[PDB]
Design a protein around this ligand. Structure first.
Ligand SMILES: [Mg+2]
Ligand SMILES: [Mg+2]
Ligand SMILES: [Mg+2]
Ligand SMILES: [Mg+2]
Ligand SMILES: [Mg+2]
Ligand SMILES: [Mg+2]
Ligand SMILES: [Mg+2]
Ligand SMILES: [Mg+2]
Ligand SMILES: [Mg+2]
Ligand SMILES: [Mg+2]
Ligand SMILES: [Mg+2]
Ligand SMILES: [Mg+2]
Ligand SMILES: [Mg+2]
Ligand SMILES: [Mg+2]
Ligand SMILES: [Mg+2]
Ligand SMILES: [Mg+2]
Ligand SMILES: [Mg+2]
Ligand SMILES: [Mg+2]
Ligand SMILES: [Mg+2]
Lengths: 195, 246, 191, 139
RNA sequence: GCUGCGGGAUGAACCGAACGCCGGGUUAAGGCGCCCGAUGCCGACGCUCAUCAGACCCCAGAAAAGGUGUUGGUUGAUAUAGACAGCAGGACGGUGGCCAUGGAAGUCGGAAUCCGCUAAGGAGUGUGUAACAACUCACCUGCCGAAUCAACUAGCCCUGA
RNA sequence: UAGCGACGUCGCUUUUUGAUCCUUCGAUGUCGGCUCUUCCUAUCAUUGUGAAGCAGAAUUCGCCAAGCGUUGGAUUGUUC
RNA sequence: GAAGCUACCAUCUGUGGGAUUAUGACUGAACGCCUCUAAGUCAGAAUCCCGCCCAGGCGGAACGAUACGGCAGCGCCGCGGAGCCUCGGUUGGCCUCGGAUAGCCGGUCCGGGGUCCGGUGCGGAGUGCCCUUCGUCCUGGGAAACGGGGCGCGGCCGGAAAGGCGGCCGCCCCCUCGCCCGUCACGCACCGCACGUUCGUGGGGAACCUGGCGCUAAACCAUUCGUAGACGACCUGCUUC
């Protein structure tokens, strides 16, 4: 069904390639925490290329023409637009299936977030190469919503800690229950058949 | 907008604002909402909204309107305004607003003399005027066939379009414009109750000291007979007579 | 050429203590404490010696610029040890032209206020770093002493002072005027 | 940090390649990428294998530098790598993965019914223990 | 031209390959991150940071020249008869040499170019005062301690742009 | 070698002119001026800087830099 | 010469934050020294972006009124029955920031340090959970003192970024098979065959008979208006005081 992807520590083109391949098959994929998607290269170069992309505009009418989004979710959505056949009613359905969110919505606070190993910064970059933050780029050029998103992110991180302490307490209780007795008759069978 | 909580006693001028045809309407606005005010069980579901308003909101804007019966106009419809209270914490802003629901706000309470306060409004209505009157371009000379008040060249050949910066026949006026940094001279009350039987005492400074009113000799041209609080602004202010300004 | 390990050796005296939680180095001593992060380098930082305090800065294969980087850690650890044992004192004599330079301090020595400034009427204010204390020296004309713990903070504040005092739109071969860093040293002498 | 380095005389697992699931012993490093390996009792012939192809372990041996197969075998059987390697949790994990790969349908049915019974008894005990925790916290 | 088809995104001439309508298999030219079929190989070896990276014959952009930015290569020179650096000390006598003249007294110039003390001083590498003077260098020595320096060459990248 | 730079030599651009005839001859209305929009930098001035044979003033040579300005007239149909 | 339009021909106003280029620097190796750079920091401007200012998207909010009359019509809950159209799945996984020259778990002491486990991760997505359950009847061994479902009832809000299921107390009609192993007999055994099994009391529209609780309006034209008008459009008035 849905594929809730974390966006922290992923590279833009790698994650866009994997999302654009998995969205043409029908798996409804949603990339959350889009402000944390890293981009390799120097951050000055990345904002210089994005400034050149802003400089690209129609001169006879700027409204009828290139629409330059500043929000990082819409940056990733344009990145996947440039890779899907969006002029056809296959890539149009794929863009309808794709959803993207800066920050985290409440149902994606509820559900578990996946992490793609092939798109990671650590996997795809030598650790002495420079990088960038898409949220830093978006706040530096246009997207004026870094502080509100960071405040709500710290709020949901505190919520995640106060849920995780309860979950870890329940896991300590169930391992006390596993430490208790009168369960081993099935457990010998399970150890002999892959506990 | 999280949620909007109105007051109880809503005036007929606000009801004329909420309706289009006041004659054809049966005047049925806010009957169930006033029933929610009257019900004691509805008060607990109404004060729960303010307890949620203290917790989840940061920007509180208060709706206010004008009394049209104190004007020489003919409109008789109020004008609703969200006014962002820039006070302290949300709790005491909400307490201030609930304390001052259904109450009047003078000009001396917020504004003051010698204050530099901007004006927002809509320009005059000049209509669908031409190019030399809209963009103030130079006229063509007398010998020009097919026009004198025109832009003579629009674009080059190789852009086979018309650029958006080219001066063309746009409608002049009735545009939203704001002008910044205008000083207030005098905020003065007028026409107080009959202890003194009718006090005029306006535009009567420390050096004038004579009986005089707000209005000029013969009333204001196309406005009327101002008998209320009034702001005495500097320079030229955007708009015609009888026009709503913020 | 992918050189196998390069290690730097640091001896730490008994007057101070060191604690590393990874690539973060926290040094505690008599003149306060000082902590820094080496997160962006990826060089192993190990210590040894039961109350002997022998630090080793060890880097494996790497490149030539990274073998250059592995000595920078040893040098900044030496600078932190010197700053936590002795501290840093920078003496700045006001090399002044016909117009003098009147220097006062306002907020606990953290706000240096400069006046008469090459004859300019504009009174200049310089806010210093969190953790550096400045003072006006005694028994010496127009000397400005900057004392602190972190060499980067102290020398960046002194750089802000010597760039705030700058001759503009003239010749700077003539008009040799400004507050320049005269002497670099430690607070506690004879060590 | 860095508990294990490559060394003359260290046993190492092989994860990738045609010798997968087999132990070797690193004799010497050739140049930065490949190392000559040898296995006397692990059914692998003396050859050169890459470091990213192999997998480092925690047990060490005492080899001379570039020793013969006889001395490799004698140091192996003196160190007793096979019984001590069976007596670790790592080989138990790999063996359990092999057993899960070698399951059949009747075995999965038995695993599933034992799984239901275990998880039901564990869930009832967790409910009883949190009931006892509430009974303790009620005064 | 008279000629489709697969690649070169798009193309008259480029590379394959020439055409009756179809099924199966295979391949050339090309390609295998997504459009867009196919490397989603636990691919191998190295090079490259570029604030204007680069990305495949014709084909759609660039030179002479330069780089103590890294990577190899060649030819030499040094060094326990303790080098390169770093810090410190000395840097004279003949002689203010000889041609010159406003001065040349190592320092604008023309020629030349040796000796003693030597541990070492070059009839002198530069700075300066117009000269005479002060400073530094060649050279020698004090501490440290074992590797170091110079000139070319071509691969990437940069400046030239 | 601040600023210059011969004898030689390597380039860039199409704001001049030249060369060719590829499209246009069942027509793309062929100079200049007026009005008006937009773009480039090889920068005249302004903002921030480096160097002078930069004492100050005034200049000259470079860098980031095209955001904003870059006139009124006598002459000539003039481009100039 | 009124009103009205108009003149730099009268008059008023035109507003600041950030990252940075050039450049100057700090610490600092490479290269014992030096060095603005190789990692890392500082200042830094008519350039850039945003604020302010304009029009607001096949963009989304909060609230009001939500059709009497004499029949009528329309909402919310729970309904039993039939029919047309459209397209997709055949279990859902209810969540710790972070790191890769480091990191997980458990735990005396004053969020932190010492100590104890595990680590090519088994407190593991090469994973976990109800699950490979077709059902029923009879009788036995383990586990089960919570029961286990809800048309449920009263309370709490958790949850504000786009919220609706989950947890606690007390009752309600029952279950002591809500489960694992053994015995017995049956249900369509449709006689070799496909689209079968699923969140489906799937999405919305037009109507059919019934219970309970409620609702009794508003736009557009016409007329007037001038603060606006080419026409449309926009701001306006209308009561029997
Ligand atoms: Mg008009
Ligand atoms: Mg004519
Ligand atoms: Mg000057
Ligand atoms: Mg032929
Ligand atoms: Mg083709
Ligand atoms: Mg091509
Ligand atoms: Mg075929
Ligand atoms: Mg091929
Ligand atoms: Mg594919
Ligand atoms: Mg061509
Ligand atoms: Mg080279
Ligand atoms: Mg280039
Ligand atoms: Mg021709
Ligand atoms: Mg021609
Ligand atoms: Mg034609
Ligand atoms: Mg034409
Ligand atoms: Mg024609
Ligand atoms: Mg411009
Ligand atoms: Mg710099």
């Amino acid at each position: 069904q849905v594929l809730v992807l974390d966006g922290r520590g992923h590279l833009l083109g790698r994650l866009a390639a994997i999302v654009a391949k998995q969205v043409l098959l029908g798996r409804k994929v949603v990339v959350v925490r889009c402000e944390g998607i890293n981009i390799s290269g120097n951050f000055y170069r990345n904002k210089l290329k994005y400034l050149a992309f802003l400089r690209k505009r129609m001169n006879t009418n700027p409204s009828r023409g290139p629409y330059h989004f500043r929000a990082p979710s819409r940056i990733f959505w344009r990145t996947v637009r440039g890779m899907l056949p969006h002029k056809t009613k296959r890539g149009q359905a794929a863009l309808d299936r794709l959803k993207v969110f800066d920050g985290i919505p409440p149902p994606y606070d509820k559900k578990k977030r996946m992490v793609v190993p092939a798109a990671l910064k650590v996997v795809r970059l030598k650790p002495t190469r420079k990088f960038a933050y898409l949220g830093r780029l978006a706040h530096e050029v246009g997207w004026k919503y870094q502080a509100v998103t960071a405040t709500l992110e710290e709020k949901r991180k505190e919520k995640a800690k106060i849920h995780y302490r309860k979950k870890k307490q329940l896991m300590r209780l169930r391992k006390q229950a596993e430490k208790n007795v009168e369960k081993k008759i099935d457990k010998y069978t399970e150890v002999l058949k892959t506990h | 907008t999280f949620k909007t909580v109105f007051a109880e006693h809503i005036s007929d001028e606000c009801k004329r604002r909420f309706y289009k045809n006041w004659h054809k309407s049966k005047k049925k606005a806010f009957t169930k909402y006033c029933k929610k005010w009257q019900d004691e069980d509805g008060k607990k579901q109404l004060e729960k909204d303010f307890s949620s308003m203290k917790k989840y909101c940061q920007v509180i804007r208060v709706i206010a309107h004008t009394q049209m019966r104190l004007l020489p106009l003919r409109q008789k419809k109020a004008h609703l305004m969200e006014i962002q209270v820039n006070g302290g914490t949300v709790a005491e802003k909400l307490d201030w607003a609930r304390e001052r629901l259904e109450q009047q706000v003078p000009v001396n309470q917020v504004f003051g003399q010698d204050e530099m306060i901007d004006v927002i409004g809509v320009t005059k209505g000049k209509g669908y005027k031409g190019v030399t009157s809209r963009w103030h371009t130079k006229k063509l000379p007398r010998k020009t066939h097919r026009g004198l008040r025109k832009v003579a060249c629009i674009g080059a050949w190789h852009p086979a379009r018309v650029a958006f910066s080219v001066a063309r026949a746009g409608q002049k006026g009735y545009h939203h414009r704001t002008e910044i940094n205008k000083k207030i001279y005098k905020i003065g009350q007028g026409y107080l109750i009959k202890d003194g039987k009718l006090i005029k005492n306006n535009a009567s400074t420390d050096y004038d000291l004579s009986d005089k009113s707000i209005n000029p000799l013969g009333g204001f041209v196309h406005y009327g007979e101002v008998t209320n609080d009034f702001v005495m602004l500097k320079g030229c202010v955007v708009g015609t007579k009888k026009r709503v300004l913020t | 050429m992918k050189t196998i390990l390069s290690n730097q050796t640091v001896d730490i005296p008994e007057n101070v203590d060191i604690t590393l939680k990874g690539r973060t180095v926290i040094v505690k001593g008599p003149r306060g404490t000082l902590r820094r992060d080496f997160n962006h380098i990826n060089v192993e930082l190990s210590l040894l010696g039961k109350k002997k305090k022998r630090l080793r800065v060890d880097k494996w294969w790497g490149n030539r610029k990274e073998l250059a980087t592995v000595r920078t850690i040893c040098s900044h650890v030496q600078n932190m040890i010197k700053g936590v044992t002795l501290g840093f004192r920078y003496k700045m004599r006001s090399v002044y032209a016909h117009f003098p330079i009147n220097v006062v301090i306002q907020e606990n020595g953290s706000l240096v206020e400069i006046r008469n400034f090459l004859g300019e009427k504009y009174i200049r204010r310089v806010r210093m770093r969190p953790g550096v204390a400045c003072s006006v020296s005694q028994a010496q004309k127009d000397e400005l002493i900057l004392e602190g713990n972190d060499i980067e903070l102290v020398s960046n504040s002194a750089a802000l002072i010597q760039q705030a005092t700058t001759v503009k739109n003239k010749d700077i071969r003539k008009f040799l005027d400004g507050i320049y860093v005269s002497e670099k040293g430690t607070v506690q002498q004879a060590d | 940090v860095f508990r294990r380095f490559v060394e003359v005389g260290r046993v190492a697992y092989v994860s990738f390649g045609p010798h997968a699931g087999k132990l070797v012993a690193i004799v010497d490093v050739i140049d930065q990428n490949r190392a000559l390996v040898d296995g006397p009792c692990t059914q692998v012939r003396r050859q050169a294998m890459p470091f990213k192809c192999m997998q480092l372990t925690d047990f060490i041996l005492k080899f001379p530098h570039s020793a013969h197969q006889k001395y490799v075998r004698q140091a192996w059987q003196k160190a007793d790598i096979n019984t001590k390697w069976a007596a670790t949790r790592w080989a138990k994990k790999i063996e359990a993965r092999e057993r899960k790969a070698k399951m059949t349908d009747f075995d999965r049915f038995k695993v599933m019914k034992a799984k239901k019974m275990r998880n039901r008894i564990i869930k009832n005990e967790v409910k009883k223990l949190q009931k006892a925790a509430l009974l303790k916290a009620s005064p």
